[PDB]
Design a protein around this ligand. Structure first.
Ligand SMILES: COc1cc(C(=O)c2cc(O)cc(F)c2)cc([N+](=O)[O-])c1O
Ligand SMILES: COc1cc(C(=O)c2cc(O)cc(F)c2)cc([N+](=O)[O-])c1O
Lengths: 116, 116, 116, 116
């Protein structure tokens, strides 16, 4: 699993469950080509987005639908979404975890990368 | 000053100076129109982007050029940029500080909103 | 002002007002001696804790009463407090801002240090 | 596993490996009784600190030796350590993950709690 997304909720101290996540790869045209999508599991994790062969070097965008998450909880959110844009695999394929920690008016994101 | 952007460096424990920031506003046709730009000062702050009259209700995008900041320090960071997208002034005029705290493989962002 | 503490609320997108803050300095016998205390203002900031002359080299502890802040809003938060312990002025006098960004089940803290 | 600690490195975008972690429970005397300790694994995780029977309600302190971690990497750190103090199990036993995301001049901590 070369790409995993994990979303956490800092208000409830829990995984952020059922969060929609969309992944895009920048076309050599310079626009965002759809790549994969899913919703986070009960553990806040979204696995199985891509494969080793498909996840080539490039610029990728992960869009996390934070606004829908907070609205479903009845909590006013600040952001329209949380976007993470990064270059992948430029020094060889790696296993990427993109983690996001959500609050209504703030979010954090980190990359945890491991070499298999 | 209804919109201020502040950028901090979590590696050196300092303001992030000379960071380029571009602001866009979503037009009626759903395209992003250039709204304002600038660079952070010695305090990490960017003031004077807009005025009370100009900063109407809308969806705004703040794009912080974090990659150039790290590259100038010799570092190849994870993110291409840090983008913050939000609806502004939906309940009347507010003053917004958009803060970002930067590390090579992570960033946090928060909004501090006050009622004038 | 060589030591300032700033506290922000990530749920409401606002300063965290009226947060109690206690500062201690480690004595020669390794005990924590009370150094200064105060509460955050309407801006989330606590100024005037110490002076250039008093704020000598040492190990300092800043204890932020985050639990009382959340409890007053009806929330039972995860943390009992947020503590920040650091060596100060080891390379000469500096001005320190200790910032904390609060959510019920998470907090972040950073230092912004400038040379007077 | 009722209590797990996970430590991540925001500078390298990786788990924080071999970080020393010490856990204490507040005595009814009001001082910190040693409880468990360990070092983070290659995944940045520390498992097996306690058991369901032993991890009773109480106030617990997790001390993460961040200073030694940064020193071993040759990077100047701000904090003497990162402490997380929390009340556990007051609404019944839960599975707690205490996560910490480390930078040299900043850290974050969150609790991810799941009900089995
Ligand atoms: C529950 O398990 C995990 C928790 C966490 C976090 O708490 C976290 C903390 C932050 O400050 C920021 C963030 F984006 C995530 C990160 C990972 N991870 O990355 O592998 C986990 O497996
Ligand atoms: C230097 O003083 C400030 C510090 C800070 C932070 O520590 C901070 C923490 C985070 O997790 C994320 C972030 F984007 C900023 C925020 C503001 N602010 O918003 O006005 C400050 O004035």
């Amino acid at each position: 699993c070369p790409l995993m997304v994990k979303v956490l909720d800092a208000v409830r101290g829990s995984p952020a469950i059922n969060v929609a996540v969309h992944v895009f790869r920048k076309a050599a045209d310079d626009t965002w080509e759809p790549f994969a999508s899913g919703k986070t599991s009960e553990s806040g994790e979204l696995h199985g987005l891509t494969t080793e062969e498909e996840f080539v070097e490039g610029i990728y965008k992960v869009e996390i639908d934070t606004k829908s998450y907070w609205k479903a909880l009845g909590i006013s959110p600040f952001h329209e979404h949380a976007e993470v844009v990064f270059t992948a695999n430029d020094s060889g394929p790696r296993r990427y975890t993109i983690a996001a920690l959500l609050s209504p008016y703030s979010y954090s994101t980190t990359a945890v990368i491991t070499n298999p």
